[PDB]
């Protein structure tokens, strides 16, 4: 009798639904007089109205039904919200359940607390309009549309009993990231993971236009959602008496199929991809609000979004209509004299931790356990001489990630956009394979590592791929993202959304526990110009990350494999940061030992003693490199200068943590003025060789005393197709161009080095001519190694 | 049958008691191999041993009995710990109950978590030996001995159903603050407050000496506890079979009397001070540990404190004795294969929020509600002309505190050590009176304001009085402390103890929610030399507070009544600070309006425009004052200089928030370099007139550019008896001495002002001679007022 | 060698030679501070019931010259004992010195008025307080967040009534204790550490050192007959070891560097001669600390106290103080020094920054020192104890 609904409890469900809408309108409009004991006056209304009403009836409608299903089947829900502006619906339900009062004791369940609850919403020094980290039981910010469904799947990536209900707006479904994210059901594993229940809020209208998915035929819509792999269920109408029975029946129909699918998967009798249930709602937008106000339809139209009435203080007629709107819910029966909800509402509320707004999954920091990290020195390469031994840097990282997977089989996953095999990270394929959950052929068995059980997800769309990881970290688990640098502009919008969540959660919100860090690995840098990716790769993703504060993002550019392992090991321990690691796929030199890499990453910036020419004397020039390809050119430039100028004294500095360049005033993590002056001399010129746009170094090191003597060579532009050496020549980061620049800046080499500067220009022209004749660099360029 | 014990449950209680002691020794000694699956080896033992063992058996003994009693009577307990070094006992019980695993997911209830649990204790990057804020269910740090009983009463000051069980060591009872704190039962109100059950751990030995209270006769000890007003109960012996029955019976005897007392008080039939229950334990120190190790008695002696055996790694014989010590608890039956406690231990543990280590009272920030306070502008005095109207500054504050009491009748109390009437704070006596709960005479009714119900605590022992407030804030309530400045050295030790609690809770601990701030009001400054207090008052309390970091303490020196109200209003909103407010009882001038005071306290330090001589031109000298008495002298010096030097341009600056002087690098609260240079110009001399030791200003403003031009006048020494004017002359903070100082620093007044400097010295000599003949200052000195 | 044992033997000899007008006071820390040498001839006084277990373990008898009680307030015994005309000695932890904060100000008030204002008051014996188990060692007893702030509040009182002594080793401790038992109208605060340490001064050399109060250590000083490049000064005893260890590192890595080592025992000698006749003159101060070379002061306690005393000096702007700032929850003795930057490596880093001709030459060494800081912290986290060569360090020259 779960599908059927009793009439007596339907009134209580409707009573909860009315109370949620009453509190929703109250915080949008009312500033004082919460229970309308006295007649409404303009001083009780907020001066500026930034709330959104169009999505509020739908979210409150679904939420009360879900509480009914939790009471019977003892489920656990999260309710990630799609539209994101339906926060008044969420906060009203959280207040009714008592969760909001427990989290915020000021907003007590009383008349005075109700006045404070309405006052704080959409107000300075108060909670925001969208669902922010201050909102209890929320993981998705929802301000940017299209990433809600991916966050639903990410939260259930390794929780078997968890159920998540994501409400999808029809306008939101027009976005590109949401269109692809439907296919994520295939990657989800029914045996060991939870179930996601997507709900489509097809109200029919956007802010100003009819939605695309509402103006397609019912047959076309059913065809479209069958192709995504979901079982479509349709709930239509605008009569609450009809809608309560139908929507309760459909929810009970879907959850039993969800339990049937999960039980069949765990039993192993049905090892195939099932059609997941899904619910479609055709309820009009704002169907519980005013119908017509100014001669136009304000219910079930685009006018219902965020503005029922434009002016209330100016026009007393609208205020009277507003007062009649609040009276339509009959608030007198819903609340007692004290202002608390009546005993009818208290009984039907979930009890204890089962409340969706109080679920520990949403505050994933409490659920988070520290990762078990094997020592990376086992997988580190051995270097007898720094700069003379050549080995690929991807293989040590792949072995290290494999060991973490075995030691952390549940709370760790790896993400790649069909580049894990390309990135030479096949070491993790030894113990675990990619998860596909589709039809397979024996040709696939020999070719690709595909299985139903796996810890590596591979989908081309980085929008849904990165969305999975963000929810995975906010749930309390740990993850790692590896991709090319050329396609990092795709996740540019999503990174700012996640960095916004961490920034507010760290400072403003006090009950939010810290979650795991966001680790993104960028490979196949712009300098190598691999076969994949467009010809004009852009390292501009590093710049937009630096626009965000240094207290939420960290950028690491390790030169070799050992320094890459130390960065990867250290970043897997951090909590409230976004870690961007820029390594290169191609085989390179190795400069640091396993022990020396740990000391290097501890400081972030360090002098390389073997590369440095003279110690115990003031250097004539400081040569600095940041990336790994540009580090080789910086080292090669040092070899040329030491060969031609034996008396020249060169200090070589390699930087891994970019934000160490920022002064100590900007952030405590940055180097102090005395520390910076020790590394980079106060007066001698600095020849910085930076991977990426050369101006980024000037932004960080602007406040430094020696900023005027800082010279940066970096990425400027790229030709259609170039050799690795020729590309460095055009950007003037080549070994010869750096050696030319050192001659210019050093005061006593501008006259002595004229002959050498002429010789270097001959070498630039000679290598370019050989590149045009043969198409490949000279063998001594490719096989170069440190001569000292 | 609550007093009696079943034999079967006694074994489970003993099983819990053994497991707590086993975990206690494990974290003191073991670093690896928690369950002793393999034979013990020296690499499993911690190299440096800092944990304390002497108090551990006693604390674990009481804790398990309390969990027995909390299961049957469904009570709520806090268990404030006296010795403070019994943290291994508390952490073991918290781990057994599952609270520690929930708070710290790394220390999971498993074999791996047990290894981590033992490893972290007394280790770098781990929990400390004493009861730190990291310890769940702890409000008292316990490192300083003697303040535990006051914290027991403070936590129950307004929680009626709460029960607090504070364990008192016999060596701790020799301390002065603990001896007085016994009388706090009289001030506790049984009708509206909880009951505190003190327990004496009379183990007989200190770290090196027999305790005083164990070496007195049983008759005299019983006489002493009767004099304190407690009903003494004695539990003795060293046999666990006997001790389990007797101690459980005594606990059941005491709690029913506690419930009888509370029920009788709330019924109103017994309105008299009752004899509260008291428990004495004669159990030997470390009576569950080794007896003899090196030919000396290590059980029940002073050797049992913190060192069972001195060396374990060096001597394998002690390691064998250590291994036999762990085997004596029979750990195999207590834990399963996974390492979790067996089902016998799980059943007897408290369930949910009823756990003593998981009570929300201990983490009072969750329980804290924001204080509802009226607008202070209602009680602010009216000033038509600044500096010309004379009114006492204490009366507006007393009225403001009275209004807060009415609006917050439950979560607010006021504390004053026999000086609330002296400080002219009788405005709060209008609505509420001080609580005494003793015999009363009609002479007391007319003279004093005493009643059973009250919100003002009055006891001149500043030790026990300040201890009540600290627990009251950590419980989540709000309070206010008002006392003389002369006796502020008494609570000097307690402030440092509370400051280190807030410092750790803010930064290191993440689950600690912010508590209310500590507001201390200092009256009767050293300059007025009131009748009370010693002749040589010391303002040195301000200096020791500044030794603590600026991010945990704030010091405010409001000049007048309106600025006092703004400071008091602002500090009642703050959360994680110690607020020290220094004002003077004596009637003074008024300089700021109600609106202007709010702007002044917003900036903290600002230019007084009316006192400033010339605007739109560079001032010749900056005259700054910090206190209130010295502000009058600074203003009077300005009047003299403007009278004798019409062309002189003087900028007057008043400083209220002391820590604003610190540079922005030291703390974000401090003024920036540009802001400081605007207030005090970069080149002109600054004549600072500071209440207190003059060097404190140089400590704060040391890093400033214009520090070398800063001249501070302040308290140096005080004669035996002096007039208020003559005392300023001795310390050279008088109006004439300040005017003399300005003449010296200003370059163009050193020659022109020679005649005026001679005249000022005549005025100094003239007033001193009049003071010797008459004993009082001249009438125009006392009735001075701003002439412009 | 441990520095507590020579003081205990000396206190025992005073007790026998002065059986009536001398007593010792300790708040259950005389045995803790390894002062059991006085237990040989005299025992603690209890006057209560006794058991044979107490007889074997504790030294208790009806007749005794050592007072033991937990409450430091009932220091009140000693103050009246001195005003009676007799002599005493107080030994306690530094962590609980804030307890007697109010009482000390009362006694110093009495002495200052009696010395100057009152003429018929005859001088009485001095108040000698010994503070043991300093904040740097972090012993098992006491709260983890020990505060050396008691030294600061004593300095707030006039230099004519309070004297603060920080002897580095056992011999310098005896000379301070011997000298302070002769003084009359002063409050003597002696800060020594319980734990076993190095020894730097001979019996004769300690007497000369305490006579001057502050003096150059010739063996620790690098070059004589030439102007030193930097002056390394230490005041306490734990920080003296770090100051010496920093000197060893700099002399090893910079053979040409000239370092003058100065040790300060009497704190108030830093005050100028104008403030008090006891303080050093301007010429004497300029001889010890050069007028232009940087001074790397390593002070036990709050680092600002040195700036208060030496504010009026000509070379105050070149004075750099490293001292106690904050303490972690639990740390190794070396790790605690790293947090407050008084470690041997942090001092060596500060010398490199301050010396003008080492800011460029010492960049490699400064990088090496930062590696040593990180390496020792990592070893501390893995093992919980410092490396064996750190604990067993000794002067290599
Ligand atoms: C990519 C993108 N395009 C446009 C917007 C602006 N926007 C915010 S809410 C909204 C309304 C669309 O919401 P819909 O999915 O129709 O939700 P419903 O009203 O049915 O809840 C729009 C256009 C946005 N945030 N992101
Ligand atoms: C005022 C003060 N003096 C000395 C100490 C040093 N101390 C720390 S713990 C301790 C032992 C306290 O003895 P007791 O109260 O008998 O405790 P238990 O026997 O239960 O360990 C002492 C003396 C202190 N903390 N405070
Ligand atoms: Mg819509
Ligand atoms: Mg004891």
Author numbering:
A (entry chain C), B (entry chain B): 9 to 796
C (entry chain A): 399 to 472, 474 to 796
Give me lines lifted from the publication on this model.
Given the importance of the physiological role of SeXPK, we solved the cryo-EM structures of SeXPK, both free (with coenzyme TPP/Mg2+ bound) and complexed with the non-hydrolyzable ATP analog, AMPPNP. In contrast to the published XPK structures from Lactococcus lactis and B. breve/longum, which exist as dimers in crystals, the cryo-EM structure of SeXPK is a dodecamer composed of six dimeric units, forming a circular donut-shaped array both for the AMPPNP-bound form and in the absence of AMPPNP. Of note, while the dimer–dimer interface in the SeXPK dodecamer involves residues near the C terminus, the B. longum XPK octamer involves residues near the N terminus. As the donut-shape or four-leaf clover shape-like particles or two-dimensional (2D) class average images were not in perfect symmetry, we further examined whether the assigned symmetries were pseudosymmetry. Some relative random motions were observed between different dimers in both SeXPK dodecamer and B. longum octamer assemblies, suggesting the likelihood of pseudosymmetry in these structures. The root-mean-square deviation between the structures with and without AMPPNP-bound is very small: (0.42 Å from 7,897 Cα atoms of the dodecamer and 0.36 Å from 1,256 Cα atoms of the dimer).
